[PDB]
């Protein structure tokens, strides 16, 4: 269902930006086909398809655009197996490699720190993060997008009163409607903190577009 | 191109006293406006020689600009700039375009002596008074060329040999065929570049033997080029 929500609402960079670099692959350790290695070790024939099904399923969960092209076994694990998996993304010409651990039902695990790039936000997380960025941005900060932002700084230092709480609540309603069409605000609650009398706590509750 | 003959037949305004108009010949003294590429070339040349004659390149550049009947101008080789007794006369060789030749042979164009005197007079006006430039007709020297050939299967050898003569004459005698290709001014005939030229013809499969012989000297060996004197222009003959 996470795929369904991601396709409907979109995918994008996570906020705040984060960067990762995966661990290096010791290429001088994988020079033996897994299928020949299992066949040589007289493992059962029906185990080959069950083994390969586990590899394909685990990789697809890691990245569902993958298409396995080759597989190899580390020479330093001759029956906890270390596998270097080679795959292509969709119908592209790009190839990538990824380490894994196979255990003989067969179980396959992926190395924890293997992906290189940015962190992404999908579906509900994307729209939730989108509203968060709007709250933290003041108008005039975005270059060539001077209108974008919420602008709650204008209500600071005002006396805490019924007029202020309604002004804050109605301001949020109008700005979210203008700059966030994928979300609908269902309730806003403004309260004054007891331990810190000078601070206001705003509770915002949102629902997705067409979620019902 | 100029206005073709028999173009004007009637005046723009109708006149009842005028019958057909005869225009037997083409127009003349026409020149298109300068293109940008030609403009840059002319200015670059002008900044180099400053409309004056001091060096051999200045003589060749200025003469070809002024006179359209010239295909190429030759000057003495570098072996004579070391001559100690010096030289009274600076001798150049003018190879005219075959279209402007004063004789019948297209392969050996010759300019009238009156024409050559005009170029000498014009060029001397932009030179130091202590120089004497002389422009003379070239001395054509035949270079006999004989080759043994293997033609592409299905082609009659006599037809292939005839076509090869036309191709080589076009390549090595550019002034003959309406001077449309810039080729060396009959200075040297290198053995192997000539061999490559022959084998590039679609009718030629392989050259088995090639020999070049000058008019008087003995036939050269394999890989021997042919030189020309400072007043000579080599011409291929069969």
């Amino acid at each position: 269902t996470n795929k369904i929500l991601a396709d409907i609402y979109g995918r994008g960079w996570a906020f705040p930006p984060q960067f990762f670099i995966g661990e290096r692959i010791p290429y001088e350790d994988y020079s033996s086909d897994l299928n020949k290695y299992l066949s040589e070790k007289k493992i059962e024939a029906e185990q080959i398809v069950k083994i390969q099904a586990c590899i394909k399923e685990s990789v697809m969960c890691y990245d569902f655009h993958a298409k396995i092209t080759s597989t190899q076994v580390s020479k330093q694990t001759n029956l906890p197996l270390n596998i270097l998996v080679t795959y292509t993304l969709g119908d592209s010409e790009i190839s990538q490699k990824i380490q894994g651990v196979l255990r003989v039902p067969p179980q396959f695990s992926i190395k924890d720190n293997s992906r290189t790039g940015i962190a992404i936000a999908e579906g509900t997380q994307n729209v939730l993060q989108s509203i968060n960025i709007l709250f933290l941005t003041e108008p005039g900060e975005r270059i060539m997008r001077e209108d974008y932002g919420c602008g709650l700084n204008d209500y600071l230092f005002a006396n805490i009163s019924d007029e202020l709480m309604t002004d804050i609540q109605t301001h949020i309603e109008e700005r979210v409607l203008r700059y966030e069409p994928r979300a609908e605000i269902t309730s806003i609650q403004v309260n004054q903190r007891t331990n810190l009398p000078s601070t206001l706590h705003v509770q915002v509750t949102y629902a997705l577009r067409g979620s019902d | 191109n100029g206005l073709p003959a028999d173009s004007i037949t009637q005046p723009v305004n109708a006149l009842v006293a005028i019958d057909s108009i005869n225009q037997p010949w083409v127009s003349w003294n026409g020149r298109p406006e300068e293109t940008e590429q030609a403009f840059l070339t002319r200015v670059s040349a002008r900044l180099s020689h400053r409309n004056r004659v001091l060096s051999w390149d200045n003589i060749v550049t200025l003469l070809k600009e002024q006179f359209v009947s010239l295909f190429d101008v030759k000057y003495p080789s570098a072996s004579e700039l070391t001559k100690i007794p010096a030289q009274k006369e600076q001798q150049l060789i003018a190879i005219p375009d075959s279209r402007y030749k004063d004789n019948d042979d297209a392969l050996r164009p010759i300019l009238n002596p009156a024409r050559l005197a005009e170029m000498v007079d014009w060029i001397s006006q932009l030179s130091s008074p202590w120089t004497t430039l002389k422009i003379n007709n070239p001395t054509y020297v035949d270079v006999l060329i004989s080759y043994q050939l293997v033609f592409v299967t299905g082609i009659n050898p006599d037809y292939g040999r005839h076509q090869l003569q036309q191709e080589l004459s076009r390549k090595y005698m550019p002034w003959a065929e309406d001077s449309a290709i810039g080729v060396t001014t009959g200075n040297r005939i290198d053995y192997y570049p000539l061999l490559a030229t022959i084998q590039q013809s679609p009718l030629v499969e392989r050259v088995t033997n090639l020999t070049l012989k000058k008019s008087s000297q003995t036939a050269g060996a394999v890989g021997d080029s042919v030189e020309a004197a400072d007043n000579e222009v080599l011409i291929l003959v069969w």
């Binding site: 995918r11 994008g12 960079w13 705040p16 930006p17 960025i133 975005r142 060539m144 700059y179 | -």
Partner: protein, 93 residues
């Protein structure tokens, strides 16, 4: 001698951003589909897009001004080209 009146529409920030979004669609359309005002990747790119527009605007300045170095370098008696390269010395002999 200035290119600004000719190219002032190709230097604009919106024109350059449209090209950038086209490349992102073509190359990574199935992994980066949210390209609105709120996407953190877009804001970093939009800043770079403004910087690219600023760089292009500099190139569209008058030609004679871009050939002029600092005041402390400008040689006395010269101009865009040095005095000896004028018509009175380059066309005469």
């Amino acid at each position: 001698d200035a290119l600004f009146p000719i190219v002032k529409d190709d230097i604009a920030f919106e024109t350059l951003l449209t090209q950038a979004k086209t490349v992102i669609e073509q190359q990574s359309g199935q992994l980066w589909s949210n390209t609105e005002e709120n996407d953190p990747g877009i804001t970093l790119l939009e800043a770079c897009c403004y910087g690219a527009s600023d760089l292009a605007y500099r190139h569209s300045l008058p030609l004679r001004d871009l050939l002029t170095p600092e005041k402390q370098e400008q040689t006395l008696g010269d101009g865009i080209f040095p005095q000896e390269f004028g018509p009175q010395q380059m066309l005469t002999c």
